[PDB]
Structure 1
Amino acid sequence: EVYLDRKLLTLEDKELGSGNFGTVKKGYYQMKKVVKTVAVKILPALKDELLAEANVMQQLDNPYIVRMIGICEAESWMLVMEMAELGPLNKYLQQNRHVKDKNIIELVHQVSMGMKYLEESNFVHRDLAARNVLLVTQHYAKISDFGLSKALRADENYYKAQTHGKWPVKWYAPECINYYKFSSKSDVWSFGVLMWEAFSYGQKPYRGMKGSEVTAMLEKGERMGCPAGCPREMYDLMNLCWTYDVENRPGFAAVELRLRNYYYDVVNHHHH
Structure 2
Amino acid sequence: YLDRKLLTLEDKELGSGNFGTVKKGYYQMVVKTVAVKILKPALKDELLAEANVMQQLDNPYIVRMIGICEAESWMLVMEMAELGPLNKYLQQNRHVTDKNIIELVHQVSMGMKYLEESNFVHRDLAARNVLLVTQHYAKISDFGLSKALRADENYYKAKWPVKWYAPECINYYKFSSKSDVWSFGVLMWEAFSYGQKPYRGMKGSEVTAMLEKGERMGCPAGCPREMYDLMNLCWTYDVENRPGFAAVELRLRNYYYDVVNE
TM-score (norm 1): 0.96
**Whole-Å separation in 2 of the counterparts to 1:149 and 1:53:** 7
- Measured against aligned partners, the alpha-carbon deviations of 1:224-249 in whole angstroms (never above 9, x if no partner) come to 00000000000000000000000100
Q: CA deviation at 1:72?
A: 0.2
Give the CA deviation at 1:254: 0.1
Q: Distance in 2 between matches of 1:189 and 1:148?
A: 16
Aligned equivalents of 1:207, 1:77: Cα separation in 2 = 36
- Structure 2: give runs of 5+ residues left out of the alignment: none
| Matching residue of 2:181 | 188
The superposition leaves residues 148-178 of structure 1 with CA deviations (integer Å, 9 ceiling, x where unpaired) of: 00000000000000xxxx1000000000000
Alpha-carbon distance between aligned partners in 2 of 1:16 and 1:101, rounded to the nearest angstrom: 27
Instruction: Tell me the C-alpha RMSD between the 2 structures.
Output: 0.3
- Partner of residue 229 from structure 1, selected from 218, 222, 234: 222
User: Residue 27 of structure 1 corresponds to which residue in structure 2?
Assistant: 25
Residue 201 of structure 2 aligns to a residue whose secondary structure is: coil
Structure 2 residue 94 is matched with structure 1 residue 97: yes
Alpha-carbon distance in 1 for matches of 2:170, 2:102: 29
> Structure 2: how far apart are the matches of 1:79 and 1:195?
28
Q: Look up the match of 2:253.
A: 260
Cα displacement (A) at 1:212: 0.3
- Equivalents in 1 of 2:22, 2:15: separation in Å? 5
Which residue of 194, 204, 207 corresponds with 1:201? 194
2:127 to 125, 130, 142: 130
Alpha-carbon distance between aligned partners in 2 of 1:186 and 1:107, rounded to the nearest angstrom = 21
Give the SS at the match of 1:222: coil
The number of aligned residues is: 261
Tell me the distance in 2 between the aligned counterparts of 1:42 and 1:187. Answer: 26
1:112 aligns with 2:116: no
The CA distance in 2 between the partners of 1:218 and 1:65, in whole Å, is: 30
2:13 corresponds in structure 1 to 15
SS of equivalent residue, structure 2 residue 142: coil
Tell me how far apart the structure 1 counterparts of residues 19 and 255 of structure 2 sit (CA, whole Å).
39
Residues in 2 aligned to 1:121 and 1:236: alpha-carbon distance in whole angstroms: 27
Q: Distance in 2 between matches of 1:231 and 1:266?
A: 10
Separation in 2, partners of 1:263, 1:29: 36
Instruction: Give the Å deviation of 1:117.
Output: 0.2
Residue-by-residue CA offset, 1:194-242 (whole Å, 9 max, x unaligned): 0000000000000000000001100100000000000000000000000
Q: Deviations over 1:64-97 (max 9, x none)?
A: 0000000000000000000000000000000000
Question: Which digits, 9 at most, give the CA deviation of each residue in 1:118-142, with x for residues without a partner?
Answer: 0000000000000000000000000
**What is the distance in 2 between the residues matched to 1:68 and 1:263?**
29
Measure, in 2, the Cα distance between the counterparts of 1:85 and 1:20.
22
Aligned to 1:144: 141
Does residue 53 (structure 1) correspond to residue 44 (structure 2)? The answer is: no
Q: Which residue of 1 aligns with 2:33?
A: 37
Q: Deviation digits for residues 43-63 of structure 1, max 9, x if unmatched? A: 000000000000000000000
Partner residue, 1:245: 238
- TM-score when normalising by structure 2: 0.99
User: CA shift at 1:19, angstroms?
Assistant: 1.3
Distance 2:123 2:258 in 1: 31
Distance 1:98 1:115 in 2: 26
Deviation at 1:7, TM superposition (A): 0.2
